[PDB]
Amino acid sequence: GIFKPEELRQALMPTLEALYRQDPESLPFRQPVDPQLLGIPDYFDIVKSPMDLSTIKRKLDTGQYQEPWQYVDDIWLMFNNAWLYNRKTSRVYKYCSKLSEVFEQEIDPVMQSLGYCCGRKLEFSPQTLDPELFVECTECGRKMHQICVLHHEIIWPAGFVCDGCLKKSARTRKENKFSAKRLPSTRLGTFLENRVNDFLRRQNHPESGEVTVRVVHASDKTVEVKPGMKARFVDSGEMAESFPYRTKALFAFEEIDGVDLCFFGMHVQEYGSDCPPPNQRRVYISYLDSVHFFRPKCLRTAVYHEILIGYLEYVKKLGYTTGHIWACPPSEGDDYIFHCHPPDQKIPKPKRLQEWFKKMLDKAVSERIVHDYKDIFKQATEDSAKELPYFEGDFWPNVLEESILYATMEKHKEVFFVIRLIAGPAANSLPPIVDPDPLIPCDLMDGRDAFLTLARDKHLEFSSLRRAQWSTMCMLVELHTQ
Ligand SMILES: COc1ccc(NC(=O)CN(C)C(=O)C2(c3ccccc3)CCCC2)cc1
Ligand SMILES: [Zn+2]
Ligand SMILES: [Zn+2]
């Protein structure tokens, strides 16, 4: 026992009385359902654990609840039975939804007054609902959402100690060494975060946190020319068989309410100077993703721009001549790089996404980082299908197979950006591209599949700030302990 029964009763009874006072919405919930009198003889075939307000009151009054989650559980048992048994359009269903809304408001400040994280009954997103897990304070015995208190067994193996118990004993929580800042740095990561933090300091907005950019994957790969064009151009001995590239994964994190938040992810393909044409000295953005919790809101878009402009600046200086972006929005539900985006984070329509890349590239011109950029139509004109750069997982390889030319580039022109970084003479007499960062092997971050799979297995959602904080903590433990 943590509480005197009278203490628990005096704290919770007012939240019960809040529900009882709601009339008519409490009328179906005041007494045990009597299926005979109500003419619903199938009630007990569907509802196996009936619960009502008079029962909960008698449990409070007789000291039956040992800790308040038991009370919250009986409340949500009572709501769930009504939502299970009654139609969505029914009066009782709608009354039950009203009481759940009044309960949500009342329980929170009460559960926080008794030293709990919150009073919420929490389930994961559909991907039947998996319940959120609880951890137990080793000092006081209170149970709390694992996600509310960000308790990870690998970071803190001796167990969870709540803020209230730590303050009581004049201790602070042992530092999280599995942080984004303590991930191994790269010249690329440093260059990007230095550009982002220089920009944020110049803005001098009080809400902004430090930003971290970490390259977390770097491996050498090859894209093989698919059979239906190997037959035409490769087998003859005209086009090269396979194009070697470096695949890199990077993430940007922000300090929000004292902890790491992963808010941006990018995969790139880097076809260097020892790469046969038409891929020679090109970079390709495989995929971009974000989680909209960057603070402040008013700088979110600029920060994304600073990372992307930063990346183009950096590869230019190494000797890449051209950047390529397939400006195509995702369509994998609430997933892409990040599992389970916030439900109010809208995927942009093709037009808005094109206007967003356009805006980013106009700033890059103003800075003399991008010399010029155009749609693949106007750059194919200004330059056979053998001469198009051939990138792993891109639209263009797949569409030339559907055929086996100029027809297709016109109808889908605005979705393909070609970005001249080094144009004209300067491009001709360049040193070899040498990447000064080591290879970073990491199977979890090798393409976007493996991390989506882990996030599905382990309910690493990005659907709210609190869940995105827990998922950021969990991904960083994985990245440090590989
Ligand atoms: C509801 O489920 C979702 C939600 C979002 C995504 N992903 C994107 O929006 C992925 N994207 C297109 C983005 O992040 C940018 C974006 C977003 C919005 C406007 C303009 C640009 C911001 C960083 C790069 C591009 C996927 C599923
Ligand atoms: Zn909680
Ligand atoms: Zn405690």
Side-chain angles (χ1 to χ4, degrees), residues 28-29 31-35 38 40-52 74 76-86 92:
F29 302 98
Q31 287 286 332
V33 165
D34 183 344
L38 296 187
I40 49 182
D42 73 333
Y43 185 71
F44 291 152
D45 307 329
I46 291 153
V47 175
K48 296 313 202 183
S49 320
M51 187 53 54
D52 73 286
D74 270 353
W76 286 84
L77 175 52
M78 172 189 74
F79 297 154
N80 282 313
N81 291 337
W83 291 319
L84 177 59
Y85 186 68
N86 301 277
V92 171

PDB file of all heavy atoms in Angstrom, residues 28-29 31-35 38 40-52 74 76-86 92:
ATOM      1  N   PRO A  28     -27.451   5.746 -17.817  1.00  0.00           N
ATOM      2  CA  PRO A  28     -27.228   4.320 -18.093  1.00  0.00           C
ATOM      3  C   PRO A  28     -26.117   3.635 -17.279  1.00  0.00           C
ATOM      4  O   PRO A  28     -26.017   2.390 -17.362  1.00  0.00           O
ATOM      5  CB  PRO A  28     -26.744   4.302 -19.554  1.00  0.00           C
ATOM      6  CG  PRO A  28     -27.147   5.639 -20.126  1.00  0.00           C
ATOM      7  CD  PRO A  28     -27.037   6.586 -18.946  1.00  0.00           C
ATOM      8  N   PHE A  29     -25.299   4.435 -16.559  1.00  0.00           N
ATOM      9  CA  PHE A  29     -24.040   4.017 -15.889  1.00  0.00           C
ATOM     10  C   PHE A  29     -24.194   4.031 -14.353  1.00  0.00           C
ATOM     11  O   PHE A  29     -23.251   3.612 -13.665  1.00  0.00           O
ATOM     12  CB  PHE A  29     -22.902   4.907 -16.389  1.00  0.00           C
ATOM     13  CG  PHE A  29     -22.711   4.858 -17.881  1.00  0.00           C
ATOM     14  CD1 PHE A  29     -23.251   5.826 -18.703  1.00  0.00           C
ATOM     15  CD2 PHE A  29     -22.048   3.796 -18.483  1.00  0.00           C
ATOM     16  CE1 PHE A  29     -23.095   5.765 -20.080  1.00  0.00           C
ATOM     17  CE2 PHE A  29     -21.875   3.738 -19.859  1.00  0.00           C
ATOM     18  CZ  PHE A  29     -22.417   4.721 -20.661  1.00  0.00           C
ATOM     19  N   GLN A  31     -26.159   2.294 -12.132  1.00  0.00           N
ATOM     20  CA  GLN A  31     -26.486   1.060 -11.387  1.00  0.00           C
ATOM     21  C   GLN A  31     -26.054  -0.098 -12.263  1.00  0.00           C
ATOM     22  O   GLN A  31     -25.981   0.055 -13.477  1.00  0.00           O
ATOM     23  CB  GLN A  31     -27.980   0.994 -11.050  1.00  0.00           C
ATOM     24  CG  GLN A  31     -28.412   1.953  -9.942  1.00  0.00           C
ATOM     25  CD  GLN A  31     -28.001   1.574  -8.524  1.00  0.00           C
ATOM     26  OE1 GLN A  31     -27.826   0.400  -8.166  1.00  0.00           O
ATOM     27  NE2 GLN A  31     -27.813   2.585  -7.685  1.00  0.00           N
ATOM     28  N   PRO A  32     -25.811  -1.284 -11.670  1.00  0.00           N
ATOM     29  CA  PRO A  32     -25.536  -2.488 -12.456  1.00  0.00           C
ATOM     30  C   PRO A  32     -26.631  -2.652 -13.515  1.00  0.00           C
ATOM     31  O   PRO A  32     -27.786  -2.489 -13.198  1.00  0.00           O
ATOM     32  CB  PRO A  32     -25.535  -3.635 -11.428  1.00  0.00           C
ATOM     33  CG  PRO A  32     -25.291  -2.953 -10.098  1.00  0.00           C
ATOM     34  CD  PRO A  32     -25.900  -1.571 -10.230  1.00  0.00           C
ATOM     35  N   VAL A  33     -26.223  -2.852 -14.762  1.00  0.00           N
ATOM     36  CA  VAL A  33     -27.130  -3.188 -15.889  1.00  0.00           C
ATOM     37  C   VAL A  33     -27.929  -4.421 -15.454  1.00  0.00           C
ATOM     38  O   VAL A  33     -27.326  -5.413 -15.040  1.00  0.00           O
ATOM     39  CB  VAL A  33     -26.329  -3.444 -17.187  1.00  0.00           C
ATOM     40  CG1 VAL A  33     -27.169  -4.135 -18.251  1.00  0.00           C
ATOM     41  CG2 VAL A  33     -25.724  -2.172 -17.742  1.00  0.00           C
ATOM     42  N   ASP A  34     -29.247  -4.343 -15.528  1.00  0.00           N
ATOM     43  CA  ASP A  34     -30.139  -5.515 -15.332  1.00  0.00           C
ATOM     44  C   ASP A  34     -30.728  -5.896 -16.686  1.00  0.00           C
ATOM     45  O   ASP A  34     -31.687  -5.277 -17.134  1.00  0.00           O
ATOM     46  CB  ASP A  34     -31.203  -5.169 -14.298  1.00  0.00           C
ATOM     47  CG  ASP A  34     -32.119  -6.322 -13.976  1.00  0.00           C
ATOM     48  OD1 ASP A  34     -32.143  -7.293 -14.747  1.00  0.00           O
ATOM     49  OD2 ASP A  34     -32.786  -6.231 -12.947  1.00  0.00           O
ATOM     50  N   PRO A  35     -30.145  -6.875 -17.406  1.00  0.00           N
ATOM     51  CA  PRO A  35     -30.550  -7.147 -18.785  1.00  0.00           C
ATOM     52  C   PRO A  35     -32.035  -7.516 -18.963  1.00  0.00           C
ATOM     53  O   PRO A  35     -32.555  -7.225 -20.029  1.00  0.00           O
ATOM     54  CB  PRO A  35     -29.647  -8.311 -19.199  1.00  0.00           C
ATOM     55  CG  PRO A  35     -28.440  -8.204 -18.274  1.00  0.00           C
ATOM     56  CD  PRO A  35     -29.041  -7.749 -16.961  1.00  0.00           C
ATOM     57  N   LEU A  38     -34.118  -4.303 -18.804  1.00  0.00           N
ATOM     58  CA  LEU A  38     -33.791  -3.441 -19.973  1.00  0.00           C
ATOM     59  C   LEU A  38     -34.138  -4.137 -21.291  1.00  0.00           C
ATOM     60  O   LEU A  38     -33.953  -3.485 -22.316  1.00  0.00           O
ATOM     61  CB  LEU A  38     -32.302  -3.065 -19.940  1.00  0.00           C
ATOM     62  CG  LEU A  38     -31.858  -2.205 -18.743  1.00  0.00           C
ATOM     63  CD1 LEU A  38     -30.417  -1.742 -18.882  1.00  0.00           C
ATOM     64  CD2 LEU A  38     -32.759  -0.996 -18.530  1.00  0.00           C
ATOM     65  N   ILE A  40     -32.417  -6.591 -22.831  1.00  0.00           N
ATOM     66  CA  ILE A  40     -31.169  -6.830 -23.619  1.00  0.00           C
ATOM     67  C   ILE A  40     -30.540  -8.133 -23.143  1.00  0.00           C
ATOM     68  O   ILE A  40     -29.427  -8.145 -22.616  1.00  0.00           O
ATOM     69  CB  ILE A  40     -30.220  -5.618 -23.521  1.00  0.00           C
ATOM     70  CG1 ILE A  40     -30.017  -5.165 -22.070  1.00  0.00           C
ATOM     71  CG2 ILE A  40     -30.738  -4.485 -24.413  1.00  0.00           C
ATOM     72  CD1 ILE A  40     -29.136  -3.964 -21.910  1.00  0.00           C
ATOM     73  N   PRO A  41     -31.231  -9.276 -23.356  1.00  0.00           N
ATOM     74  CA  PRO A  41     -30.827 -10.550 -22.772  1.00  0.00           C
ATOM     75  C   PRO A  41     -29.445 -11.036 -23.220  1.00  0.00           C
ATOM     76  O   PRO A  41     -28.902 -11.913 -22.541  1.00  0.00           O
ATOM     77  CB  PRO A  41     -31.896 -11.550 -23.265  1.00  0.00           C
ATOM     78  CG  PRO A  41     -32.588 -10.869 -24.437  1.00  0.00           C
ATOM     79  CD  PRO A  41     -32.479  -9.391 -24.139  1.00  0.00           C
ATOM     80  N   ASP A  42     -28.912 -10.493 -24.326  1.00  0.00           N
ATOM     81  CA  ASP A  42     -27.564 -10.875 -24.824  1.00  0.00           C
ATOM     82  C   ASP A  42     -26.475 -10.050 -24.125  1.00  0.00           C
ATOM     83  O   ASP A  42     -25.304 -10.198 -24.512  1.00  0.00           O
ATOM     84  CB  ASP A  42     -27.471 -10.778 -26.348  1.00  0.00           C
ATOM     85  CG  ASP A  42     -27.419  -9.369 -26.922  1.00  0.00           C
ATOM     86  OD1 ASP A  42     -27.939  -8.435 -26.273  1.00  0.00           O
ATOM     87  OD2 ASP A  42     -26.858  -9.213 -28.021  1.00  0.00           O
ATOM     88  N   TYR A  43     -26.804  -9.230 -23.131  1.00  0.00           N
ATOM     89  CA  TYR A  43     -25.851  -8.237 -22.577  1.00  0.00           C
ATOM     90  C   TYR A  43     -24.627  -8.976 -22.025  1.00  0.00           C
ATOM     91  O   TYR A  43     -23.465  -8.673 -22.452  1.00  0.00           O
ATOM     92  CB  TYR A  43     -26.507  -7.328 -21.533  1.00  0.00           C
ATOM     93  CG  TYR A  43     -25.563  -6.251 -21.062  1.00  0.00           C
ATOM     94  CD1 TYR A  43     -25.207  -5.201 -21.897  1.00  0.00           C
ATOM     95  CD2 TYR A  43     -24.948  -6.340 -19.829  1.00  0.00           C
ATOM     96  CE1 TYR A  43     -24.290  -4.245 -21.495  1.00  0.00           C
ATOM     97  CE2 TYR A  43     -24.013  -5.409 -19.426  1.00  0.00           C
ATOM     98  CZ  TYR A  43     -23.684  -4.354 -20.258  1.00  0.00           C
ATOM     99  OH  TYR A  43     -22.798  -3.417 -19.816  1.00  0.00           O
ATOM    100  N   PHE A  44     -24.877  -9.974 -21.168  1.00  0.00           N
ATOM    101  CA  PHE A  44     -23.832 -10.784 -20.484  1.00  0.00           C
ATOM    102  C   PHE A  44     -23.153 -11.749 -21.464  1.00  0.00           C
ATOM    103  O   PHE A  44     -22.049 -12.215 -21.118  1.00  0.00           O
ATOM    104  CB  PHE A  44     -24.410 -11.506 -19.256  1.00  0.00           C
ATOM    105  CG  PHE A  44     -24.793 -10.614 -18.097  1.00  0.00           C
ATOM    106  CD1 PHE A  44     -25.791 -10.989 -17.218  1.00  0.00           C
ATOM    107  CD2 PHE A  44     -24.128  -9.433 -17.838  1.00  0.00           C
ATOM    108  CE1 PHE A  44     -26.159 -10.177 -16.156  1.00  0.00           C
ATOM    109  CE2 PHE A  44     -24.495  -8.611 -16.780  1.00  0.00           C
ATOM    110  CZ  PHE A  44     -25.497  -8.996 -15.928  1.00  0.00           C
ATOM    111  N   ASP A  45     -23.706 -12.037 -22.650  1.00  0.00           N
ATOM    112  CA  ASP A  45     -22.939 -12.815 -23.674  1.00  0.00           C
ATOM    113  C   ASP A  45     -21.834 -11.948 -24.273  1.00  0.00           C
ATOM    114  O   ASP A  45     -20.869 -12.510 -24.752  1.00  0.00           O
ATOM    115  CB  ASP A  45     -23.771 -13.313 -24.852  1.00  0.00           C
ATOM    116  CG  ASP A  45     -25.002 -14.092 -24.431  1.00  0.00           C
ATOM    117  OD1 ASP A  45     -24.941 -14.727 -23.387  1.00  0.00           O
ATOM    118  OD2 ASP A  45     -26.015 -14.022 -25.140  1.00  0.00           O
ATOM    119  N   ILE A  46     -21.983 -10.619 -24.268  1.00  0.00           N
ATOM    120  CA  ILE A  46     -20.999  -9.710 -24.927  1.00  0.00           C
ATOM    121  C   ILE A  46     -20.113  -9.080 -23.845  1.00  0.00           C
ATOM    122  O   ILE A  46     -18.901  -8.970 -24.101  1.00  0.00           O
ATOM    123  CB  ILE A  46     -21.733  -8.689 -25.829  1.00  0.00           C
ATOM    124  CG1 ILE A  46     -22.347  -9.395 -27.047  1.00  0.00           C
ATOM    125  CG2 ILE A  46     -20.812  -7.551 -26.245  1.00  0.00           C
ATOM    126  CD1 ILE A  46     -23.569  -8.719 -27.637  1.00  0.00           C
ATOM    127  N   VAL A  47     -20.703  -8.698 -22.706  1.00  0.00           N
ATOM    128  CA  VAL A  47     -20.004  -8.013 -21.582  1.00  0.00           C
ATOM    129  C   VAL A  47     -19.809  -9.033 -20.460  1.00  0.00           C
ATOM    130  O   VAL A  47     -20.805  -9.420 -19.815  1.00  0.00           O
ATOM    131  CB  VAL A  47     -20.751  -6.754 -21.101  1.00  0.00           C
ATOM    132  CG1 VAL A  47     -20.105  -6.119 -19.878  1.00  0.00           C
ATOM    133  CG2 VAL A  47     -20.844  -5.724 -22.217  1.00  0.00           C
ATOM    134  N   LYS A  48     -18.554  -9.391 -20.216  1.00  0.00           N
ATOM    135  CA  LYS A  48     -18.162 -10.443 -19.250  1.00  0.00           C
ATOM    136  C   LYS A  48     -17.779  -9.810 -17.919  1.00  0.00           C
ATOM    137  O   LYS A  48     -17.939 -10.492 -16.897  1.00  0.00           O
ATOM    138  CB  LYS A  48     -17.009 -11.266 -19.824  1.00  0.00           C
ATOM    139  CG  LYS A  48     -17.357 -12.045 -21.083  1.00  0.00           C
ATOM    140  CD  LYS A  48     -18.660 -12.780 -20.926  1.00  0.00           C
ATOM    141  CE  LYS A  48     -18.845 -13.944 -21.861  1.00  0.00           C
ATOM    142  NZ  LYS A  48     -20.192 -14.539 -21.643  1.00  0.00           N
ATOM    143  N   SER A  49     -17.318  -8.563 -17.927  1.00  0.00           N
ATOM    144  CA  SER A  49     -16.922  -7.831 -16.702  1.00  0.00           C
ATOM    145  C   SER A  49     -17.742  -6.559 -16.561  1.00  0.00           C
ATOM    146  O   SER A  49     -17.246  -5.469 -16.811  1.00  0.00           O
ATOM    147  CB  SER A  49     -15.467  -7.563 -16.709  1.00  0.00           C
ATOM    148  OG  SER A  49     -14.833  -8.706 -17.208  1.00  0.00           O
ATOM    149  N   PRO A  50     -19.030  -6.639 -16.183  1.00  0.00           N
ATOM    150  CA  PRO A  50     -19.814  -5.426 -15.994  1.00  0.00           C
ATOM    151  C   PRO A  50     -19.196  -4.518 -14.920  1.00  0.00           C
ATOM    152  O   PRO A  50     -18.518  -4.984 -14.051  1.00  0.00           O
ATOM    153  CB  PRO A  50     -21.208  -5.965 -15.636  1.00  0.00           C
ATOM    154  CG  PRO A  50     -20.912  -7.346 -15.102  1.00  0.00           C
ATOM    155  CD  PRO A  50     -19.841  -7.851 -16.035  1.00  0.00           C
ATOM    156  N   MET A  51     -19.392  -3.226 -15.065  1.00  0.00           N
ATOM    157  CA  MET A  51     -18.911  -2.203 -14.100  1.00  0.00           C
ATOM    158  C   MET A  51     -19.797  -0.982 -14.262  1.00  0.00           C
ATOM    159  O   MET A  51     -20.151  -0.709 -15.371  1.00  0.00           O
ATOM    160  CB  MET A  51     -17.457  -1.784 -14.357  1.00  0.00           C
ATOM    161  CG  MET A  51     -16.884  -0.859 -13.281  1.00  0.00           C
ATOM    162  SD  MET A  51     -17.046  -1.516 -11.577  1.00  0.00           S
ATOM    163  CE  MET A  51     -16.277  -3.125 -11.737  1.00  0.00           C
ATOM    164  N   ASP A  52     -20.129  -0.312 -13.165  1.00  0.00           N
ATOM    165  CA  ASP A  52     -21.021   0.872 -13.113  1.00  0.00           C
ATOM    166  C   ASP A  52     -20.552   1.763 -11.942  1.00  0.00           C
ATOM    167  O   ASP A  52     -19.754   1.287 -11.084  1.00  0.00           O
ATOM    168  CB  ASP A  52     -22.455   0.409 -12.925  1.00  0.00           C
ATOM    169  CG  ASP A  52     -22.669  -0.078 -11.502  1.00  0.00           C
ATOM    170  OD1 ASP A  52     -22.194  -1.188 -11.168  1.00  0.00           O
ATOM    171  OD2 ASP A  52     -23.208   0.724 -10.696  1.00  0.00           O
ATOM    172  N   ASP A  74     -11.321   0.634 -13.824  1.00  0.00           N
ATOM    173  CA  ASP A  74     -12.764   0.292 -13.655  1.00  0.00           C
ATOM    174  C   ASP A  74     -13.619   1.323 -14.417  1.00  0.00           C
ATOM    175  O   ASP A  74     -14.675   0.949 -15.098  1.00  0.00           O
ATOM    176  CB  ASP A  74     -13.133   0.273 -12.174  1.00  0.00           C
ATOM    177  CG  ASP A  74     -12.957  -1.053 -11.489  1.00  0.00           C
ATOM    178  OD1 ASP A  74     -12.663  -2.004 -12.205  1.00  0.00           O
ATOM    179  OD2 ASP A  74     -13.142  -1.137 -10.232  1.00  0.00           O
ATOM    180  N   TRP A  76     -12.513   2.954 -17.201  1.00  0.00           N
ATOM    181  CA  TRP A  76     -12.377   2.614 -18.655  1.00  0.00           C
ATOM    182  C   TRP A  76     -12.978   1.232 -18.967  1.00  0.00           C
ATOM    183  O   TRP A  76     -13.405   1.029 -20.110  1.00  0.00           O
ATOM    184  CB  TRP A  76     -10.921   2.764 -19.162  1.00  0.00           C
ATOM    185  CG  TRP A  76     -10.575   4.205 -19.302  1.00  0.00           C
ATOM    186  CD1 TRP A  76     -10.131   5.027 -18.313  1.00  0.00           C
ATOM    187  CD2 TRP A  76     -10.804   5.028 -20.454  1.00  0.00           C
ATOM    188  NE1 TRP A  76     -10.066   6.320 -18.773  1.00  0.00           N
ATOM    189  CE2 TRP A  76     -10.459   6.347 -20.094  1.00  0.00           C
ATOM    190  CE3 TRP A  76     -11.291   4.787 -21.738  1.00  0.00           C
ATOM    191  CZ2 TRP A  76     -10.559   7.420 -20.983  1.00  0.00           C
ATOM    192  CZ3 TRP A  76     -11.357   5.841 -22.633  1.00  0.00           C
ATOM    193  CH2 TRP A  76     -10.965   7.133 -22.264  1.00  0.00           C
ATOM    194  N   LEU A  77     -13.108   0.340 -17.993  1.00  0.00           N
ATOM    195  CA  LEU A  77     -13.843  -0.935 -18.216  1.00  0.00           C
ATOM    196  C   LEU A  77     -15.304  -0.588 -18.473  1.00  0.00           C
ATOM    197  O   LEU A  77     -15.911  -1.207 -19.384  1.00  0.00           O
ATOM    198  CB  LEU A  77     -13.734  -1.830 -16.987  1.00  0.00           C
ATOM    199  CG  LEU A  77     -14.526  -3.137 -17.008  1.00  0.00           C
ATOM    200  CD1 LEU A  77     -14.245  -3.953 -18.264  1.00  0.00           C
ATOM    201  CD2 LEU A  77     -14.162  -3.977 -15.757  1.00  0.00           C
ATOM    202  N   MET A  78     -15.818   0.389 -17.708  1.00  0.00           N
ATOM    203  CA  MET A  78     -17.244   0.754 -17.742  1.00  0.00           C
ATOM    204  C   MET A  78     -17.494   1.442 -19.086  1.00  0.00           C
ATOM    205  O   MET A  78     -18.503   1.165 -19.719  1.00  0.00           O
ATOM    206  CB  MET A  78     -17.628   1.647 -16.550  1.00  0.00           C
ATOM    207  CG  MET A  78     -19.025   2.220 -16.634  1.00  0.00           C
ATOM    208  SD  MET A  78     -19.337   3.461 -15.339  1.00  0.00           S
ATOM    209  CE  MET A  78     -18.366   4.802 -16.019  1.00  0.00           C
ATOM    210  N   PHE A  79     -16.597   2.310 -19.529  1.00  0.00           N
ATOM    211  CA  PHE A  79     -16.766   2.995 -20.842  1.00  0.00           C
ATOM    212  C   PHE A  79     -16.638   1.961 -21.964  1.00  0.00           C
ATOM    213  O   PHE A  79     -17.425   2.006 -22.936  1.00  0.00           O
ATOM    214  CB  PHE A  79     -15.722   4.091 -21.085  1.00  0.00           C
ATOM    215  CG  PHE A  79     -15.763   5.248 -20.130  1.00  0.00           C
ATOM    216  CD1 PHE A  79     -14.616   5.988 -19.880  1.00  0.00           C
ATOM    217  CD2 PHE A  79     -16.945   5.619 -19.518  1.00  0.00           C
ATOM    218  CE1 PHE A  79     -14.649   7.069 -19.024  1.00  0.00           C
ATOM    219  CE2 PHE A  79     -16.979   6.707 -18.670  1.00  0.00           C
ATOM    220  CZ  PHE A  79     -15.822   7.415 -18.413  1.00  0.00           C
ATOM    221  N   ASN A  80     -15.659   1.077 -21.870  1.00  0.00           N
ATOM    222  CA  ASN A  80     -15.413   0.144 -22.994  1.00  0.00           C
ATOM    223  C   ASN A  80     -16.611  -0.777 -23.209  1.00  0.00           C
ATOM    224  O   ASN A  80     -16.872  -1.111 -24.384  1.00  0.00           O
ATOM    225  CB  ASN A  80     -14.096  -0.616 -22.828  1.00  0.00           C
ATOM    226  CG  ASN A  80     -12.931   0.272 -23.210  1.00  0.00           C
ATOM    227  OD1 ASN A  80     -12.968   0.921 -24.236  1.00  0.00           O
ATOM    228  ND2 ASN A  80     -11.940   0.384 -22.349  1.00  0.00           N
ATOM    229  N   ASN A  81     -17.261  -1.223 -22.132  1.00  0.00           N
ATOM    230  CA  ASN A  81     -18.412  -2.154 -22.222  1.00  0.00           C
ATOM    231  C   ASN A  81     -19.499  -1.447 -23.040  1.00  0.00           C
ATOM    232  O   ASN A  81     -20.116  -2.078 -23.902  1.00  0.00           O
ATOM    233  CB  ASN A  81     -18.959  -2.539 -20.845  1.00  0.00           C
ATOM    234  CG  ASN A  81     -18.037  -3.406 -20.020  1.00  0.00           C
ATOM    235  OD1 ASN A  81     -17.167  -4.085 -20.553  1.00  0.00           O
ATOM    236  ND2 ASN A  81     -18.277  -3.442 -18.716  1.00  0.00           N
ATOM    237  N   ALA A  82     -19.732  -0.175 -22.776  1.00  0.00           N
ATOM    238  CA  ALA A  82     -20.830   0.566 -23.428  1.00  0.00           C
ATOM    239  C   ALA A  82     -20.496   0.765 -24.906  1.00  0.00           C
ATOM    240  O   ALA A  82     -21.400   0.665 -25.730  1.00  0.00           O
ATOM    241  CB  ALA A  82     -21.064   1.882 -22.727  1.00  0.00           C
ATOM    242  N   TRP A  83     -19.257   1.098 -25.222  1.00  0.00           N
ATOM    243  CA  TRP A  83     -18.805   1.225 -26.634  1.00  0.00           C
ATOM    244  C   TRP A  83     -18.776  -0.159 -27.322  1.00  0.00           C
ATOM    245  O   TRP A  83     -18.927  -0.213 -28.539  1.00  0.00           O
ATOM    246  CB  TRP A  83     -17.418   1.878 -26.725  1.00  0.00           C
ATOM    247  CG  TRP A  83     -17.339   3.314 -26.347  1.00  0.00           C
ATOM    248  CD1 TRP A  83     -18.208   4.331 -26.639  1.00  0.00           C
ATOM    249  CD2 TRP A  83     -16.264   3.909 -25.619  1.00  0.00           C
ATOM    250  NE1 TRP A  83     -17.728   5.528 -26.162  1.00  0.00           N
ATOM    251  CE2 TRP A  83     -16.538   5.292 -25.535  1.00  0.00           C
ATOM    252  CE3 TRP A  83     -15.069   3.407 -25.098  1.00  0.00           C
ATOM    253  CZ2 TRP A  83     -15.674   6.170 -24.904  1.00  0.00           C
ATOM    254  CZ3 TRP A  83     -14.221   4.282 -24.472  1.00  0.00           C
ATOM    255  CH2 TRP A  83     -14.539   5.633 -24.346  1.00  0.00           C
ATOM    256  N   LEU A  84     -18.547  -1.247 -26.600  1.00  0.00           N
ATOM    257  CA  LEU A  84     -18.590  -2.609 -27.206  1.00  0.00           C
ATOM    258  C   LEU A  84     -20.047  -2.971 -27.518  1.00  0.00           C
ATOM    259  O   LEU A  84     -20.329  -3.391 -28.646  1.00  0.00           O
ATOM    260  CB  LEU A  84     -17.959  -3.640 -26.265  1.00  0.00           C
ATOM    261  CG  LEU A  84     -18.005  -5.104 -26.728  1.00  0.00           C
ATOM    262  CD1 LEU A  84     -17.302  -5.290 -28.082  1.00  0.00           C
ATOM    263  CD2 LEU A  84     -17.358  -6.005 -25.679  1.00  0.00           C
ATOM    264  N   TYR A  85     -20.946  -2.791 -26.559  1.00  0.00           N
ATOM    265  CA  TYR A  85     -22.321  -3.320 -26.638  1.00  0.00           C
ATOM    266  C   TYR A  85     -23.203  -2.454 -27.545  1.00  0.00           C
ATOM    267  O   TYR A  85     -24.070  -3.010 -28.222  1.00  0.00           O
ATOM    268  CB  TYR A  85     -22.938  -3.409 -25.244  1.00  0.00           C
ATOM    269  CG  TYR A  85     -24.277  -4.072 -25.318  1.00  0.00           C
ATOM    270  CD1 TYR A  85     -24.373  -5.422 -25.652  1.00  0.00           C
ATOM    271  CD2 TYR A  85     -25.437  -3.339 -25.194  1.00  0.00           C
ATOM    272  CE1 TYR A  85     -25.605  -6.032 -25.794  1.00  0.00           C
ATOM    273  CE2 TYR A  85     -26.682  -3.941 -25.321  1.00  0.00           C
ATOM    274  CZ  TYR A  85     -26.763  -5.286 -25.644  1.00  0.00           C
ATOM    275  OH  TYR A  85     -27.983  -5.885 -25.762  1.00  0.00           O
ATOM    276  N   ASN A  86     -23.084  -1.131 -27.460  1.00  0.00           N
ATOM    277  CA  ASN A  86     -24.019  -0.157 -28.088  1.00  0.00           C
ATOM    278  C   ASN A  86     -23.486   0.293 -29.463  1.00  0.00           C
ATOM    279  O   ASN A  86     -22.260   0.488 -29.620  1.00  0.00           O
ATOM    280  CB  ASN A  86     -24.270   1.028 -27.154  1.00  0.00           C
ATOM    281  CG  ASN A  86     -24.863   0.630 -25.814  1.00  0.00           C
ATOM    282  OD1 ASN A  86     -26.077   0.442 -25.672  1.00  0.00           O
ATOM    283  ND2 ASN A  86     -24.015   0.504 -24.806  1.00  0.00           N
ATOM    284  N   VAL A  92     -26.705   5.882 -25.930  1.00  0.00           N
ATOM    285  CA  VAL A  92     -25.820   5.420 -24.810  1.00  0.00           C
ATOM    286  C   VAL A  92     -24.339   5.563 -25.213  1.00  0.00           C
ATOM    287  O   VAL A  92     -23.499   5.999 -24.394  1.00  0.00           O
ATOM    288  CB  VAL A  92     -26.209   3.982 -24.410  1.00  0.00           C
ATOM    289  CG1 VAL A  92     -25.215   3.363 -23.435  1.00  0.00           C
ATOM    290  CG2 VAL A  92     -27.612   3.937 -23.814  1.00  0.00           C
TER     291      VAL A  92
END
